[PDB]
Symmetry: D3
Subunit: 150 residues, 6 copies
Amino acid sequence: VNKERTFLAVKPDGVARGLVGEIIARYEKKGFVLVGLKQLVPTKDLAESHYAEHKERPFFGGLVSFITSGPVVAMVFEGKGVVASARLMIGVTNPLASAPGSIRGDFGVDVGRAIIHGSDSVESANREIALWFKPEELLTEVKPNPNLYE
Amino acid sequence: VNKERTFLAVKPDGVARGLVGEIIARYEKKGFVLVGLKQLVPTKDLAESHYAEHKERPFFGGLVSFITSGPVVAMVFEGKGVVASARLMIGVTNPLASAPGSIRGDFGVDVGRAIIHGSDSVESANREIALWFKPEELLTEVKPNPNLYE
Amino acid sequence: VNKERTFLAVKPDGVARGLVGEIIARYEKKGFVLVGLKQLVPTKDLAESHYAEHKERPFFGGLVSFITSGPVVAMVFEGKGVVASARLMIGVTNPLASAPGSIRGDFGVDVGRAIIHGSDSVESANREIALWFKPEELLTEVKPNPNLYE
Amino acid sequence: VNKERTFLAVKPDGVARGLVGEIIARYEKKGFVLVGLKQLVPTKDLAESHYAEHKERPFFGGLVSFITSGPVVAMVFEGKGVVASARLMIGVTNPLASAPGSIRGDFGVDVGRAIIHGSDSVESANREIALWFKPEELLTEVKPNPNLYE
Amino acid sequence: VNKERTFLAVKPDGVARGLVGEIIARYEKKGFVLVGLKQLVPTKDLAESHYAEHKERPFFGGLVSFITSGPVVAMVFEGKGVVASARLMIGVTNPLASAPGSIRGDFGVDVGRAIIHGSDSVESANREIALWFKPEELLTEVKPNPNLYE
Amino acid sequence: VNKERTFLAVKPDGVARGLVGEIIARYEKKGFVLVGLKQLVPTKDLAESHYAEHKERPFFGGLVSFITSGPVVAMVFEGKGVVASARLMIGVTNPLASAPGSIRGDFGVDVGRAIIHGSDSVESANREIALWFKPEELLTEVKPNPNLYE
Ligand SMILES: Cc1cn([C@H]2C[C@H](N=[N+]=[N-])[C@@H](COP(=O)(O)OP(=O)(O)O)O2)c(=O)[nH]c1=O
Ligand SMILES: Cc1cn([C@H]2C[C@H](N=[N+]=[N-])[C@@H](COP(=O)(O)OP(=O)(O)O)O2)c(=O)[nH]c1=O
Ligand SMILES: Cc1cn([C@H]2C[C@H](N=[N+]=[N-])[C@@H](COP(=O)(O)OP(=O)(O)O)O2)c(=O)[nH]c1=O
Ligand SMILES: Cc1cn([C@H]2C[C@H](N=[N+]=[N-])[C@@H](COP(=O)(O)OP(=O)(O)O)O2)c(=O)[nH]c1=O
Ligand SMILES: Cc1cn([C@H]2C[C@H](N=[N+]=[N-])[C@@H](COP(=O)(O)OP(=O)(O)O)O2)c(=O)[nH]c1=O
Ligand SMILES: Cc1cn([C@H]2C[C@H](N=[N+]=[N-])[C@@H](COP(=O)(O)OP(=O)(O)O)O2)c(=O)[nH]c1=O
Ligand SMILES: [Mg+2]
Ligand SMILES: [Mg+2]
Ligand SMILES: [Mg+2]
Ligand SMILES: [Mg+2]
């Protein structure tokens, strides 16, 4: 029952830097199956729900203004431990402190331009998924590479 | 014209082999802008209209049954000469005969498993674009990297 | 010592996923010299001796039946600290927990489909080396790139 | 009956340039299955049989002296049209006239250091295979990625 | 002979697009040695003198203006037939007509934002090498990669 | 702030191994701007003065000797926290102890053939930038990639 899922989002800086394919491929190479994928310009109301936990933090206004200043490519990968692994692959919050080899470690320098958002726990994935995805935009079931699993 | 567009779709064989990131990355590095993107499972009625021009050929069914066997990730890129460049980057119809450096030449072997589709003319791109996407699913304030165009 | 050696073997899951070139390329770029290389289908008697140290564990059979289900490409690299570096490059036992940049962290997800084997000590490399190869199957006049060593 | 095979060989310059993995991966990425693989230091008598057609040409002596001055990694790939495709992927005889994207096009400059030998026709593959490979060193049959073929 | 040389210049759009490392690496992988390298901002005298074979042409005015607008990393490579070879690796004048695998064909879209300049013949090269470099800024005699030439 | 700067030097073994393009590209992909770049052959005064914090150390003698033996492509990058960040991307002193993903960990094997030097702090950097570069060989004020900083 390795149908764990996560919500990852390439943000407007990651989008404008011509980084969408590099990020998807890191995950496809790992073994994760893409069950949902679309591009959209986030609305103020999704931007604020999405990042609800930072409503009072200073940078909030600055963050919300950004995630809606342009196209974001939202996606949800599935696979065993996909949530903690995807987080590991992204790096940490400050891109300057991310180990070389992680998405932020190889491409970011400013927390303000973090390139990609990755859900931090199953509970939040679920919240963020239902939030960005109508039920029909998600694939129900299919086969991942049979060499990944037992 | 800098706002010409083409429709591309990574096929079931491309998605499954883990080539969605690899393929998007080449159009991005080329400088093309992704103005529409989404994954889905095509329906019999979508695939027939799509490959309409081959309505009666020895392999129509086998192709219509293939493009429906799994997820496709549709996309539209915009930029100068995108339709014709996108075609050069894809290769020729038979993968084996496509040169190294092209998508079909690097990854393909069978005409049946051609990995990706690309509009062949601007008449078919405007037609195929209209076929897979809705008008609110495409971007508008589009500013490609400031160093690509003079 | 510049002539230390380790034994590595791309597993059935690695060969099948098309990772033999990717994996050899990292040891070559690292500067290690390939002094023995070959592909084969392991026999029950080869695999048991190989994974001898796990003779009695809940997953021995499933691992011995896996390493025999297809081709493995065995190899031995020589160079300073090859055994320990080769281990760092591979990752930790569980792929999900391996960091990005390492072989198991970039491509692996399951402990059962660990992609590659690496000797853990020089006692086991000399033992595993002797296990898979014959003495006339390894090189002698070995001159690594002149810019790697002082 | 797409069990066509070819014999490719990374020569001592390709070997010493740390190029073995890059070449194998180009073919694994394409869809070809590795059915045989080993490393050896070619003997004068295999060097001369192998390149029998150039016995009288001037550069012969110079070629044979080279292909035996070091390790060669011999391999045989299988797949539809693998012979003409592998040739296409290698480039032409003069590396300076090879299109960027082909093995020789991206890495060679001297016909004398051509990096890789690829059989030029089925008839010669068969001759070159039996020549470098004992029957047991070759895998008999297994499954290539099912997305490559119909 | 293998001591031929060519002048390559990564133009303002290549520099700003972050392609300097990608370009230098294609040439290094090829076998050419870097004998000169520097970043400078060109001045008019130099630009008009460099782009003299086009003085009486329509697009002229803009050529000099754009190449004077920012950083250019100039370089000269040495190698057997490096002048004709570098040009092939670059592609043709229009980036849209250039093939995937070449620099302009992989990353370019506009004739006016062609990314890199490369001498078109030996006469033009020894001339251009002289305009951008003082004789002490160029290596005298090198020890190329040992396995490149016969 | 984001106008911090660091001195990076690809050492004789990096240059000879053909890694200059790979190294420059890791930094460009990261977000840093190249403000200085040149290849030169260091002279004793410069080497001893550069490697002064090690004068009274055992390996000293050899350091100066080796870095004077061939071409070095010196460079300085500017970016937010570029000094601490470049160092992390480099790895630690011993290449065998460096992690995959870092420059030394991916390509290095010997402490004495460490491939690249990178300033260890801002004080050391502004000092070293001064030793290798004349003030006119460095860009004054740049227009970095627009989507890197907040
Ligand atoms: C701490 C902090 C975060 N942010 C941004 C970084 C994130 N962008 N993304 N993705 C976003 C959310 O912060 P976060 O949840 O602390 O970081 P993450 O979970 O590692 O992404 O705020 C900011 O702009 N300024 C700050 O001071
Ligand atoms: C002519 C031909 C096409 N097809 C497939 C290959 C394509 N898949 N994709 N993309 C699709 C359309 O055929 P096509 O339009 O001739 O090929 P393309 O324009 O070069 O894509 O039919 C086939 O299976 N066998 C054939 O002989
Ligand atoms: C401990 C453990 C190992 N295995 C597998 C993973 C390995 N495949 N490879 N390489 C092999 C050996 O286990 P291991 O020796 O503990 O792992 P490694 O040294 O890090 O390779 O057993 C398993 O399937 N399940 C387990 O829980
Ligand atoms: C024409 C020519 C070939 N050679 C080398 C190039 C080849 N090395 N390999 N592989 C080998 C065989 O020549 P070939 O069969 O003409 O070339 P290929 O089939 O494209 O490989 O001779 C040479 O050294 N000098 C020459 O003048
Ligand atoms: C002839 C031509 C060139 N240019 C640009 C393209 C080149 N960019 N560079 N380097 C430069 C010189 O033109 P070119 O010599 O025709 O092309 P190149 O030798 O392949 O570079 O002007 C253009 O603006 N329009 C034209 O029709
Ligand atoms: C301390 C140390 C360094 N060196 C080498 C490694 C470095 N190569 N570079 N650049 C250089 C300076 O040593 P270092 O400052 O300890 O390491 P670095 O700052 O990480 O480079 O001497 C060595 O020979 N042995 C040692 O123990
Ligand atoms: Mg968060
Ligand atoms: Mg078509
Ligand atoms: Mg083990
Ligand atoms: Mg031949």
